[PDB]
Amino acid sequence: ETVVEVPQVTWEDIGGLEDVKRELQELVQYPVEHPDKFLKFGMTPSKGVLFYGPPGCGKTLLAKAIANECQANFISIKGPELLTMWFGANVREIFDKARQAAPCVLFFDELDSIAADRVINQILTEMDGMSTKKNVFIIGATNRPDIIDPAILRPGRLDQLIYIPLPDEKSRVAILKANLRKSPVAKDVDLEFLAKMTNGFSGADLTEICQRACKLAIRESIESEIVPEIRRDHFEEAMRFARRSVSDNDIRKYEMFAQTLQQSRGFGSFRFPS
Amino acid sequence: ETVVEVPQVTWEDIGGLEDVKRELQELVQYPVEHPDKFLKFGMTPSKGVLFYGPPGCGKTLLAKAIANECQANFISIKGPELLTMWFGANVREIFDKARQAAPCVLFFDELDSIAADRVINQILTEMDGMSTKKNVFIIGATNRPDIIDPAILRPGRLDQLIYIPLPDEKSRVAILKANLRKSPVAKDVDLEFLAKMTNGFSGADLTEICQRACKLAIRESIESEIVPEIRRDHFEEAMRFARRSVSDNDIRKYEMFAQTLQQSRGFGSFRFPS
Amino acid sequence: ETVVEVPQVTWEDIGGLEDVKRELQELVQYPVEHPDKFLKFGMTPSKGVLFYGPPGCGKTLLAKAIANECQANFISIKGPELLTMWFGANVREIFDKARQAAPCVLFFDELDSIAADRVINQILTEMDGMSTKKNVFIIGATNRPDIIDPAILRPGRLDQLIYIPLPDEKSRVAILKANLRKSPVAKDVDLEFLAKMTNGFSGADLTEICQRACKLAIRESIESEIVPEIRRDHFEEAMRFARRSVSDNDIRKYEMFAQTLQQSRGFGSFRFPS
Amino acid sequence: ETVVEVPQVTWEDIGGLEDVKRELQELVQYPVEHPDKFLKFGMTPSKGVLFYGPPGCGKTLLAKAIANECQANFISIKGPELLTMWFGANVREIFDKARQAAPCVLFFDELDSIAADRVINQILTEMDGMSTKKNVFIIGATNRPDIIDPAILRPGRLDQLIYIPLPDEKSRVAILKANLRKSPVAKDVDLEFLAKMTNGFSGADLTEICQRACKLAIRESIESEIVPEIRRDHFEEAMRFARRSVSDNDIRKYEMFAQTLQQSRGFGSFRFPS
Amino acid sequence: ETVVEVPQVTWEDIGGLEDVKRELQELVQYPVEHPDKFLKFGMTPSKGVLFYGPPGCGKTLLAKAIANECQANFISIKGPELLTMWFGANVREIFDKARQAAPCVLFFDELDSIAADRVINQILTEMDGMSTKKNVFIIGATNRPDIIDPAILRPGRLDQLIYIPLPDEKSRVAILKANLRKSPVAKDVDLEFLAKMTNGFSGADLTEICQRACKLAIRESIESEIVPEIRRDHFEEAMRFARRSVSDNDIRKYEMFAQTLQQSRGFGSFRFPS
Amino acid sequence: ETVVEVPQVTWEDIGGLEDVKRELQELVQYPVEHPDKFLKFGMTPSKGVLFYGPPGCGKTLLAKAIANECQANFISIKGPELLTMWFGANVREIFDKARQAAPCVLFFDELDSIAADRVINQILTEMDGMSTKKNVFIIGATNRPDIIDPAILRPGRLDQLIYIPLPDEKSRVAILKANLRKSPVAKDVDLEFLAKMTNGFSGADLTEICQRACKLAIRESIESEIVPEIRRDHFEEAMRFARRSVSDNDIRKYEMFAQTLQQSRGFGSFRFPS
Numbered sequence A, B, C, D, E, F: 001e002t003v004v005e006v007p008q009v010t011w012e013d014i015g016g017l018e019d020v021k022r023e024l025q026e027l028v029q030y031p032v033e034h035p036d037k038f039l040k041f042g043m044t045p046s047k048g049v050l051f052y053g054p055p056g057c058g059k060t061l062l063a064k065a066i067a068n069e070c071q072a073n074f075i076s077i078k079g080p081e082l083l084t085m086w087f088g089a090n091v092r093e094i095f096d097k098a099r100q101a102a103p104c105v106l107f108f109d110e111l112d113s114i115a116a117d118r119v120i121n122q123i124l125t126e127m128d129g130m131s132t133k134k135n136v137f138i139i140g141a142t143n144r145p146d147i148i149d150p151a152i153l154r155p156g157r158l159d160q161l162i163y164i165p166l167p168d169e170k171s172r173v174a175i176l177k178a179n180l181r182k183s184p185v186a187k188d189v190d191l192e193f194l195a196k197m198t199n200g201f202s203g204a205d206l207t208e209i210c211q212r213a214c215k216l217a218i219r220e221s222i223e224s225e226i227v228p229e230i231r232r233d234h235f236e237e238a239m240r241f242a243r244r245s246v247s248d249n250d251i252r253k254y255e256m257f258a259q260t261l262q263q264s265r266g267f268g269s270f271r272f273p274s
């Protein structure tokens, strides 16, 4: 059955970004931690955020981390589950579970997997009829934001289109440090220079690189058995066995989407003359 | 279940237009408040109106306000409800509820979401058999009036194709006043200049702008905690993050449709020679 | 349920045409009123006629009027009913009702709305197995006569393709008189000059014009209250709000269809040499 | 329910052709009337014939007449029945009825109405498993022989593709004599010259002409009432109200099909040198 | 129900070919009559063969004859049965019947009539799980071998793609002798010259010719009654009504397929140098 | 029912390759045989590999052999089983059987046969919810790797895309030795030169060649009866009866895919400067 627990992931786990972290805080923590000014001002707290960006960059990581920050249960519904709903009334049960688990951060991973459909409109019906007062917060993830119908992007539903970009160099070394730890590693590992060589490898690609280096370590030690730490040569040579999943054209079209939403923000000099 | 109550919205809440207000009064109030001349003249009161225009302009606001004016119950059926009936005889139950709640203003929000279909034809069957004597009044809203089948525009059904344009400058400041109010705001808010710099922002866009200014106020005050009114700088720095949802081409083709229906009205000099 | 009653409409109500009146008389009245020569001659009376023409010209009016002439019940099955049968065995019950109500003029309004289909084939099965002896007479209407499958136009079924053109000028003023009557109207209404200005407005358009004039009268009187006759200015200023529903291209292609059926009739000089 | 009776139609009714009469005789009468030589020779009697030709030429007439000649029950299944089978296991019941009614001439009118389908393959299954010994003979009719799948034209099924052409001049006058008879007619009716002026009118068209002339007779007599025989002028003028249903292009493509099946027969000089 | 009996057809009935006969013996007889060497060698007997070639050439005749040679039951499943299973778990019952009837030669006539499908996949599932030890032998026939999914041509399924060409002149006279016999025929029938003048007539066409000659004999004798052997003039005057069903282009593309499978076999000079 | 047993195939059987042998060893044996370093290092063992390559190269052979090496049960689900799942909840039963049989090597043969579908999504759901701790290891096979949806290639699922190329010349003679063995063969058989002539024959093609040689031996011995060793002439001549199943274009595009995955691996000089 669905697991409803507080994720152990933390902001330190993912160093991919910092502005998105603060935006998520203001979006989620403030309505629940400080429910004082929202009633004072003409603010109706947003109950929906949609994450978009290249695949395997940490959208699930961001959702889990923000759930951890507020110590609110986290419920994840995978894409295959929505697809079996499509091929296969239980969306109401999912939402009632989330409600009874409040405060909660419901998560819809790759909700665009189906891409007006039975399950999607059922989700819309259940989301619109959800009391915004309750602590339930809904987050969706999709690496193909364009193909999602706009009926989910209307007010009272998922509003904020948050972009999760490819990690930067400092961010990349942060993700590497996060992944390698909890296992033996040489005290003279480059890490930073490891990040610099990484041009456009996503978090998934860095995890794959670390996995391959560990695998080479196991192979070497197992051969020696018939050595207590991951030597430098492992990462030194395994990087030949590394590939960039996301093509530069994909990043450029993601940036085209972002620049569209930015030129939408392009309106300027309005400054209330004094 | 469906909520059947008199909306608290009022004409003051929306200042987008005035002639539409008057024609809505003549359409709805007159048959119910003054059922004295309709039977005198060869007039069969209209019982259906279809709103069309760019999305997020106040069609729902108009319907709620006109329901409030007559103090008649208001029943809304969202697009997702029709779509789930399409995917999923409940239309009959909806109409019986409306009948038992008479006087009432049944509202079909974005009824073109389905776009000859099963549910739409059931709606037509229930509407044609509805006694015009009863006070029930049916209103439909659609942001894409062209794709709607003509079977709904026939006499005895939704006849009046009303147009809801973008709010004008004075209307825009009226909407800003109607929305911003009920929350702290600086006494020296320009508002009028705020409306003038808004070129083609719809009511939804103005609401988003106000919400963003309020959000910035909350963030600033929360930082100060670790201030009691929405400063001017909030609006000044939030407008740069204001985007016009409806494109100029969309308004141009809406005006093309309106000009088609107007040149249909273009017949002129007939003046009953005397 | 289906209404089985003698329509109160009369030939006086519709002046659109006169030849069709006599042709319908010979089609319907003669087999029932004078069943003396049909068995004498080698003629099997026709039990089906299909009306075609631009929409809103009075096809239903003609059917109701001819039913009134013979004082025979009239059963109407609207397009939404056929289409809900299509989406949703009741055709047999409809025909049994017609039989038990004999003499009757069953009417299939816009039977081409479905456009070989399940309901169409069931209707054909019930019509072929219907005893031509019984007084029941079947009439169909279709604004789109071409898309109708030929399976219904075979002998023993809907055979006579009657055309209902736009009302003539004198016929237009006849329709005006038929409509505005039963309500106050100024003794000095031109009517004839009103019809002359009407270039190609159908009966529905004239009804809309009269309704708009009555609306203006209602509004003016209600304003005056806060006058007992529809003044000339009402029609004078409502005509500018009159639009011709049927485009001249539609009338031209209708006339192309008629000229096709006429050139089929174009065989000439055969004159029985003697 | 299905009617199983010996048709009263006779060869004298239809003078459309003579060779097809003899071919049908040899195909049907011989296997049943004189079942002697078939066993002697290496002949397996054919149990299927498919009629093709322009519509309304007498395929049903031919089937009924041949059934009459052998005094064998005749069962007809209309196209709408097959279509309701398609949209709607009763084919087995139809075939068992035909078997129990043996000798019988089962008739499938416009069996190509559906045009590999459920009902058609069910018919194939029931036909292949039908004992050729039994007197049952199956005849199919289709005015669109090309669109019929070839699975029905294999040996052991409908073999003989019999063409039913447009009636000749003498045949046309024979058809007229068959039609106008049994009702009053002037002793000085052309008939022969009536046929000559008829260029390409099918049997259905000639029946329509006779029906229209009778209709004019009824109209004239009933007008005189407010004359005991169909005068010459009725046919003289009603022929202006006559049309040729089948276009010359349709006849030419039917003849293209026939000439294909004839050049298939084009093999010549083989004469067994002696 | 399915008939399971040893066919009475024999190799003498069909003289279309001889090498195919021998290879069929080696395929079927050897595993069952002489199960002595297969286990000695690394030979897993084939349990599937697919016949392909122009229609009406004797594929069913070949299957029946080979079943007769081994005196093993023969089960035939016609194409309509597969199609009705497709439209309509009976494949399992068919295979259980074949198993209980072992030794048997299951035959799937025109199994490509459906042309990955439900029934064909069920057939594959039942065939793969069939113990090759058992005497059951599966043969499929299809005159359109290209459109058949390759899933059936894998090892452990129908392997051998056997080709059945048009009968040769000597083969044609053999077929004529096999068919004409058992009925009176003149002692001076050339037969051989009849075969020579037959250019590309298939077995079905030769059977049609014989049937037509017999029919003419019946007609002549039946006329003479109102003679005891089939005269030469019957064949002479019936040959002119003989048509070659299979076009030259069809045989050419069949030979294209055969030449493809032969050039695949075209690998040559490999000869084990010694 | 599904068979759960340790395959008797061994690495000595298929000599098609050597590198994939060690790769599969490190993938499967190490996590179960020596589960000492996996928890020490930060590596989560992979629980899924997907085989791709030209058909009939031994993918099933590799899976069975690797299952044999660890002495773990082996469950195979064929393509027709998945397709009857698609046309026909039992995937869960399959996985429960695999779990209860742990350690096991579940095999999905030609899982791309279906080519987001119901069965594929159910398989993904069952695979994601499968505890990686358990010894169960999942292997998939597809000779059309491109058409497979990427939903199965994400981390935590079938991850390692292993390529099974055409056997090398030494490998080809190894396969010949593995196949021909267990049956009589001459002591003076080329084998090596036999392999050299084999340019691009896959394992299935070599099996076909051996089967044809055994067939010829069977035929010659059976003729001689009416010799106890497979003579050289059998292979000498049967090679003229052999064909290469895989076209050089297919291998070229397979190598195009391989070179794509290699250029993805093309990142080079990263060598940890020191």
Ligand SMILES: CCSc1ccccc1NC(=O)C[C@@H](C)N1Cc2ccccc2C1=O
Binding pocket: A143, A144, A145, A146, A250, A253, A254, A256, A257
């Ligand atoms: C917004 C890019 S979404 C995306 C991301 C990764 C992988 C695939 C996709 N979708 C597509 O490529 C579909 C094609 C038609 N694109 C291209 C494109 C560029 C800029 C703006 C919008 C579009 C769009 O709809």
Ligand SMILES: CCSc1ccccc1NC(=O)C[C@@H](C)N1Cc2ccccc2C1=O
Binding pocket: B143, B144, B145, B146, B250, B253, B254, B256, B257
């Ligand atoms: C009437 C515009 S309705 C509309 C409004 C907002 C967003 C989308 C739409 N529909 C479309 O764009 C479909 C395309 C095909 N249009 C364009 C157009 C211009 C003028 C008149 C009629 C049409 C029409 O059918």
Ligand SMILES: CCSc1ccccc1NC(=O)C[C@@H](C)N1Cc2ccccc2C1=O
Binding pocket: C143, C144, C145, C146, C250, C253, C254, C256, C257
């Ligand atoms: C017979 C016109 S019925 C009609 C009437 C009003 C509105 C629409 C329609 N149908 C169409 O326009 C379909 C198009 C393809 N037409 C044009 C036309 C001219 C003359 C003859 C036959 C055809 C026909 O099939």
Ligand SMILES: CCSc1ccccc1NC(=O)C[C@@H](C)N1Cc2ccccc2C1=O
Binding pocket: D143, D144, D145, D146, D250, D253, D254, D256, D257
């Ligand atoms: C054999 C004429 S069947 C026919 C008869 C009346 C009315 C309609 C039809 N069908 C068609 O017209 C379809 C078109 C594609 N034709 C034309 C044609 C000429 C000669 C030979 C074969 C074909 C054929 O398949």
Ligand SMILES: CCSc1ccccc1NC(=O)C[C@@H](C)N1Cc2ccccc2C1=O
Binding pocket: E143, E144, E145, E146, E250, E253, E254, E256, E257
């Ligand atoms: C192998 C001939 S199969 C056949 C036999 C009789 C009647 C019809 C058919 N199929 C077709 O005609 C379909 C078309 C597309 N062909 C032509 C052709 C020539 C050579 C090789 C392969 C093909 C093929 O797939």
Ligand SMILES: CCSc1ccccc1NC(=O)C[C@@H](C)N1Cc2ccccc2C1=O
Binding pocket: F143, F144, F145, F146, F250, F253, F254, F256, F257
């Ligand atoms: C990836 C080749 S899988 C394959 C193997 C054998 C037989 C058939 C197939 N599939 C195809 O041929 C589909 C066509 C469209 N190809 C060609 C191709 C070359 C290189 C890279 C990718 C593609 C691809 O998607």
